[PDB]
């Protein structure tokens, strides 16, 4: 008698988009391309400052920030050609991510397996006899069969479904 929540309310349909400006683009190129400056007023402090303030008020980022939008990571450290330390920071972050993503897998990566491998060796007529797990599996199967047999023999009969044409009046 409860029907109000037969349909899912939360579903995994979220999508996240990131858009960046070219890394090699300078500040002047970004100001000119975005319609806050013209090619003539380049190399003038007042024009550059006015364009920078106009960019910072119309856009939510500094003119030296190439992150148009970042929903995937919400990063606050743009990678720019001018700032060489940002490249070093990105390299450090990517190597740390490499180590961490390979340190989280439960089966794919295991240094202990690399240094202490476990091997299966064929030595007898029985493939199962070369591994204790398969022997345990066989014993468990036999145990289940014996339990089923004794449980069914205890009852002494077996109910069955018998056809009835009275069903088809």
């Amino acid at each position: 008698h409860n029907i109000r929540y037969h349909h899912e309310i939360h579903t995994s349909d979220q999508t996240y988009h990131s858009s960046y400006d070219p890394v090699g683009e300078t500040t002047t190129e970004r100001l000119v391309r975005y319609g806050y400056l013209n090619k003539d007023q380049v190399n003038n402090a007042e024009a550059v400052a006015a364009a920078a303030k106009e960019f910072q008020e119309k856009e939510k980022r500094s003119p030296s920030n190439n992150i148009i939008i970042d929903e995937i990571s919400n990063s606050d450290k743009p990678i720019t050609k001018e700032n060489r330390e940002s490249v070093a920071h990105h390299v450090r972050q990517q190597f740390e991510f490499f180590r961490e993503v390979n340190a989280e897998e439960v089966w794919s990566v295991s240094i202990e397996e690399k240094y202490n491998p476990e091997l299966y060796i064929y030595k007898t007529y029985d493939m199962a006899a070369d591994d204790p797990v398969w022997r345990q599996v066989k014993l468990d199967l036999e145990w289940t069969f014996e339990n089923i047999a004794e449980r069914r023999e205890s009852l002494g009969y077996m109910p069955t479904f018998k056809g009835d044409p009275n069903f088809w009046q």
Binding site: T15, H17, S18, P22, G24, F97, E100
Partner: peptide
């Protein structure tokens, strides 16, 4: 899970715009 964008590709290729997506689908 640990995730990172493949952003070094557009770092090396400095003349390219970057447009990336991640989805739960």
């Amino acid at each position: 899970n640990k995730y990172m964008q493949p952003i070094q590709l557009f770092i090396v290729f400095e003349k390219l715009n970057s447009k990336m997506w991640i989805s739960k689908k």
